[PDB]
Amino acid sequence: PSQTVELFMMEATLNDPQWSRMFMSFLKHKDARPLRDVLAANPNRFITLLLRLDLQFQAIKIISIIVKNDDSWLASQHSLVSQLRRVWVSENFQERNWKEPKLLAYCLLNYCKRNYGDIELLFQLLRAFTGRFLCNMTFLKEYMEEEIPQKRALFFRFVDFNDPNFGDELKAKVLQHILNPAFLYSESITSVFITKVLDPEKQADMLDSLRIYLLQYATLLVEHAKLRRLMTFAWPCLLSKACVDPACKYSGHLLLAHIIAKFAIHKKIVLQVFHSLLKAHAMEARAIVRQAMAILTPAVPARMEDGHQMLTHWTRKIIVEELVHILHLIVQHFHHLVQHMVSAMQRLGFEQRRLAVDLSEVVIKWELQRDKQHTDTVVNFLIRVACQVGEVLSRRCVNLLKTASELKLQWFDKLLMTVNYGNICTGLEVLSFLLTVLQSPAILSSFKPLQRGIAACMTCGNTKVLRAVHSLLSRLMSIFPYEELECLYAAVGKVIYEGLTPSQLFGTLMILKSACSNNPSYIDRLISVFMR
Amino acid sequence: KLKMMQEVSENFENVTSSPQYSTFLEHIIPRFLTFLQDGEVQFLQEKPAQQLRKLVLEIIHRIPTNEHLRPHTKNVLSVMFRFLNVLICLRIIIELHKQFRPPITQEIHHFLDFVKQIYKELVLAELPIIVVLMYQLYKLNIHNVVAEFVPLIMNTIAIQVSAQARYADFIAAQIKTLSFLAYIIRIYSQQMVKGMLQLLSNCPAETAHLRKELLIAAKHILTTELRNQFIPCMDKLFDESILIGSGYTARETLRPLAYSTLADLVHHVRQHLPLSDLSLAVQLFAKNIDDESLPSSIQTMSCKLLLNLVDCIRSKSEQESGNGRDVLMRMLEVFVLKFHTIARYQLSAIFQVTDCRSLVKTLVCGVKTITWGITSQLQPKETQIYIKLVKYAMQALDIYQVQMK
Structure with missing residues (x-):
């Protein structure tokens, strides 16, 4: 082979793209190992080459092919990297190429896999943004599965830092990203003591992404070998015009809460951080505030009566200002909050009815642990969920209530006013309150409103309204074993019977079924005519 | 006693009243008109003289009615208008409008004098936003479009950075005002392209918060056909650069919306x-x-x-x-x-x-x-x-x- 690579295949012929592609096709052949070897033994012509752009890309292609054939070909790394880094850094201003940067980065990473984290591992992050760089990013992210298997001692200052003086903070961002899993997976040596204070570099602002990730990492770093030092990290952006994105606010506040959870349950900060965390977020910082609040969630009840759970005073303002769906969760995880449980129903209406379902479990928990505030709130929740027409949560409400009226009187008219959506919903409309009457004297106490309502409802039997009739006749068959409503409905059934003179037949016979059963005591008069 | 009741307004009033819907509205309204009519506030100085008067907000919060505000809308709005930071008056006016959305009232055609209290630019846009929000009672019949028509906004979206530093006191107010202006002109190319990109490149630089409401408003306005299909085409897509939402992972959260909105642009x-x-x-x-x-x-x-x-x-x-x-x-x-x-x-x-x-x-x-x-x-x-x-x-x-299948 050795004659080919220089007979009609030297640099002067690499200008032709088809010729180069044919050469790379030969090189790609698995069995052509000697043809690749003739070059693998002579990296000098690559070294002379890579310091033009077309031949640079061709050299990258050929060297990447060689490395793919022989990944162990790191012997020339110590000479190749010197210019590989040069071109890797330079190409950013050259373009920022079809596949060249990804190939070059793959070569750099492969040579890096022969060592743990070092300068080149930092530098290979430089470009990014090209082809979305997912190839190289995944390559390196998977490479931590090998890197993590002792390099941590001073990684913070021999892989980080290094002042590339060309790249931006993304160098620190991605390095911290990959640093976190190594510490999560795996001594509290003295170096960390000094590093925790070297971190800020005694800067005065540190209000950036780097602080966010660094504090997120250090949140678990304070076990054992004070308050003022942590204060410098936690406090800084309380400056007025800064910290406009609550992300950095909540990161520092979460770290502080972790400090509070550790030993620092003090009246200086404990009541200050809480009422300030739940503010200033509207749509996206809500996903950040919840986790920070989770850390204070166990800490606050550790005081409880010592603070009187005074946060009702804060709520008196917050409810007017804006959300408050964090206050009662202490009981759900499990006391005197029933005195203001009314706020849940008070704040609804033009809407987020979900809180009622959430608070039903808390209310039953209160009842088991320790009311008139429940018997009306439950009916209000029931009617408000019925306004949707939903979900088994509405049934869950009553199910939990009965372990230890308004909607009834509303829904008779709510069906009388009938409309396609109403017709569809009619089954749920009736079922919502007809499920309670099967387990309460609600109808037996007074069925006259129902007689007023339902008497003009079964006549609308069609599609889903028929299913409503099926539901209601079932309740009739339970109530009967009221005579006036039975007589009215029997008259309705008889007139429908005479109406025939098969959907009509289906409705007629279903009403006849409703009238029937109930023990034969009442069916004889009906049966007298069924022959026709 | 009236002066110190403000701090204890929760006591002795809810016990001695019940028809307060129509019997103590006529008590609060005169109280408001007698308390707020002085208005010795300052906007270009230190803490104003009227700083001690903030306590009246709770009484304002305790306004009784949600209906029949016809005799008590214009007077209370106008006495506030006499005030000409400016948030000292906006705090009260916002509550006045917030309690004013539900009730029925009229003579809202005073918009022509109201605009004189609104941006002139030779946070104010909040009031017209709530106005257009509860506009359902009258809709465009009150003002047509003139309060926010083209000639008002064609002056570089009616807003531009006047001082490079002063910085929240100015830039945050500008941030809110631009968003409200966009949200109101939503209803109905120099402004909405050139001023759009210019403000994108300069205003959200603090921590990119502006991009949230600004981008939502951009989506809403670009829903309006010709304002999407024809008007923005002058850009030549040169606004697809980094200027749209550069910053922290607020970028990550909002960029999906930006890409979808520009995809809607492209669709046409x-x-x-x-x-x-x-x-x-x-x-x-x-x-x-x-x-x-x-x-x-x-x-x-x-x-x-x-x-x-x-x-x-x-x-x-x-x-x-x-x-x-x-x-x-x-x-x-x-x-x-x-x-x-x-x-x-x-x-x-x-x-x-x-x-x-x-x-x-x-x-x-x-x-x-x-x-x-x-x-x-x-x-x-x-x-x-x-x-x-x-x-x-x-x-x-x-x-x-x-x-x-």
Whole structure:
């Protein structure tokens, strides 16, 4: 082979793209190992080459092919990297190429896999943004599965830092990203003591992404070998015009809460951080505030009566200002909050009815642990969920209530006013309150409103309204074993019977079924005519 | 006693009243008119003299009625208008409007004098925003459009940075005002392109918070047909640069909306965009189609848009044929990148499955259309790319088969 690579295949012929592609096709052949070897033994012509752009890309292609054939070909790394880094850094201003940067980065990473984290591992992050760089990013992210298997001692200052003086903070961002899993997976040596204070570099602002990730990492770093030092990290952006994105606010506040959870349950900060965390977020910082609040969630009840759970005073303002769906969760995880449980129903209406379902479990928990505030709130929740027409949560409400009226009187008219959506919903409309009457004297106490309502409802039997009739006749068959409503409905059934003179037949016979059963005591008069 | 009751207004009033809907409204309103009528506030100085008067807000909060505000709307609004930071008055006026949305009232045609209390620019936009929000009672009959018409906004969206430093006291107010102005002109090219980009490049620099409401308003205004199909086309897509939402992961949270909104733009400006603009658009979507920042929703939308984009590019490229072939090679390189993403979808085999199926459908239609375009050393590279496509497509169909018509 050795004659080919220089007979009609030297640099002067690499200008032709088809010729180069044919050469790379030969090189790609698995069995052509000697043809690749003739070059693998002579990296000098690559070294002379890579310091033009077309031949640079061709050299990258050929060297990447060689490395793919022989990944162990790191012997020339110590000479190749010197210019590989040069071109890797330079190409950013050259373009920022079809596949060249990804190939070059793959070569750099492969040579890096022969060592743990070092300068080149930092530098290979430089470009990014090209082809979305997912190839190289995944390559390196998977490479931590090998890197993590002792390099941590001073990684913070021999892989980080290094002042590339060309790249931006993304160098620190991605390095911290990959640093976190190594510490999560795996001594509290003295170096960390000094590093925790070297971190800020005694800067005065540190209000950036780097602080966010660094504090997120250090949140678990304070076990054992004070308050003022942590204060410098936690406090800084309380400056007025800064910290406009609550992300950095909540990161520092979460770290502080972790400090509070550790030993620092003090009246200086404990009541200050809480009422300030739940503010200033509207749509996206809500996903950040919840986790920070989770850390204070166990800490606050550790005081409880010592603070009187005074946060009702804060709520008196917050409810007017804006959300408050964090206050009662202490009981759900499990006391005197029933005195203001009314706020849940008070704040609804033009809407987020979900809180009622959430608070039903808390209310039953209160009842088991320790009311008139429940018997009306439950009916209000029931009617408000019925306004949707939903979900088994509405049934869950009553199910939990009965372990230890308004909607009834509303829904008779709510069906009388009938409309396609109403017709569809009619089954749920009736079922919502007809499920309670099967387990309460609600109808037996007074069925006259129902007689007023339902008497003009079964006549609308069609599609889903028929299913409503099926539901209601079932309740009739339970109530009967009221005579006036039975007589009215029997008259309705008889007139429908005479109406025939098969959907009509289906409705007629279903009403006849409703009238029937109930023990034969009442069916004889009906049966007298069924022959026709 | 009246002066110190403000701090204890919760006591002795809820006990001694009940019809306060129509019996103590006529008590609060005169109290408000007697308390707030002085207004010795200051806006360009230190803490104002009236700083001690803030306590009246609780009494304002305790306004009784949600109906029949006709005799008590205009007077209370006007006495506030006498005030001419300015938030000292906005705090009261916002409550006045907040309690004013429900009740029925009239003579709101005083908008022509109200505007004199609104931006002049020789936080104020909040009041017209709540006005247009509860406008359901009267709708455009009160003012037509004049309060926010073209001539008001054509002056560089009526707002521009006057001082480079002063910085929240000025820039935050400007941030809110621009958003409210956009949200009100929503109803109804120099402003909404040039001022749009100029403010994008300068205003959200603090921590990029502005981009949230600004981008939502941009979506809403771009829903309005001609304001999307024709008016913004002057940009030449040059606003697709970094200026749109640069910053922290607030960028990550809002960029999906920005990309979807500009995709909506493209859906229509596909009608007439030139070949170079289409080329740079497909270039950006080449990065989009594989972005890790969001689930396949963005990737699906990007390829779906690319479908009609390449329809238009196929229509255009046949003319002069040379730039046509040039762009053809790179558009098929885009789906070369797509097959390369499939090469990782292979490993991704380890609900979202339905989204992946939809993505496969979309990109299959895309490659079909791309090939249709190509057919309407070229062949050897065609064969190479098709070999890659065939080898990688089975790896996606295998996930397609996971656990049909």
